[PDB]
Amino acid sequence: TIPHLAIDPFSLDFFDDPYPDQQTLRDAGPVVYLDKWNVYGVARYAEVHAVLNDPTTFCSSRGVGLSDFKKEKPWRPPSLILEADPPAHTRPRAVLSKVLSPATMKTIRDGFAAAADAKVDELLQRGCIDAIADLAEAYPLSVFPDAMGLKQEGREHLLPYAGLVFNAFGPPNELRQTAIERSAPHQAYVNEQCQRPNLAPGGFGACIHAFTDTGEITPDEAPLLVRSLLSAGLDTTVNGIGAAVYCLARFPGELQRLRSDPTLARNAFEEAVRFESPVQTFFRTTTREVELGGAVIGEGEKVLMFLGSANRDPRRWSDPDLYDITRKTSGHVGFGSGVHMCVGQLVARLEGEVMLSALARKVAAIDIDGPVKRRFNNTLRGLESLPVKLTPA
């Protein structure tokens, strides 16, 4: 009654061109079974959205990766927010919400925007750049580690530690095993910067530690909460900004509309998050037998959500394969949905907005002038190299 497919969604063939296989998964039915890894899969918008908004049935405490924490030891201590269900999740989420709050964005907006404008000026003087290393990576590295309050030395561990966290959500393929086999130096760096003494005052990390007085989190919880932001806060925005530049390179008609109204910068980024979905997939675990779209799913089973596929489901979106910077993007699941919805989305949207704003005002054309290279990750989608030529406005 549930179709069985042999598609491996964690194979290099799938990462290269996931959209044909994603249509196959959507059209096979609301719920499929993935024989390769012995998990259920949901790829339409309706079921992906329903799983995300039923945290009691589809829990996160047994892991949001393939590994089931009731069966295998986690490779690192589980996240206190990402891999926690209510009520345990509520207090750490509230703290992170207040740290990354609307009121907090007012404190950083001018600095984030100025660094965005400075970087575009620096790239325009170079002309032929790599939009990944020189922009998608360079810009967030110049604002987020400082916003975190991190020291200057050692920041080369941040992106490797991030790509390790997102590879480790996947199955035990070579991508995951090769990452974990090199983890120790990055884990040691990250775990040290989470201690209150090593975080500059006024930064995100210090603010989390200051929330131990309220009774929302204890002092021993604060280091793992800083770890969350160092795990989720950098590589996702890199891939998001990378995707936006990619989209503007592939759809010059949208760059022209953006140039003619730079207030579209925020929705241009949001649409790139829908269109590319930097976070492609992750898992939930069923706490009971549950009927999902006419198919019953036993207790203790892993359910794989295709977030990128749900952001391109024609049953929910009009012309989903088109990059449209004036689309009503509200309702996309690129930031998740429900109680776990990305608590750092204001930081991501801010970085994306001010960077697309800088490009909208300073750049007249973005032309790909070199081999594009994809970066392969079990959970992240994005580019390794994007050779582009920037033409000043």
Ligand code: MH0
């Ligand atoms: C500064 C911090 C920060 C930034 C920036 C950030 C940027 C991004 N993120 Fe995202 N992310 C951050 C910190 C988190 C946390 C701590 C959590 C876990 C929240 C919870 O309650 O479990 C999270 N993000 C949760 C999520 C989830 C939902 C996970 C789940 O349901 O299990 C998604 C899909 C996500 N993110 C995507 C993205 C994308 C896409 C971007 C950027 C374009």
Ligand SMILES: CCCCc1ccc(C(=O)O)cc1
């Ligand atoms: C399922 C991946 C969502 C992004 C993410 C990664 C890590 C954390 C964390 O370390 O808590 C949170 C969210």
Ligand SMILES: [Cl-]
């Ligand atoms: Cl770690």
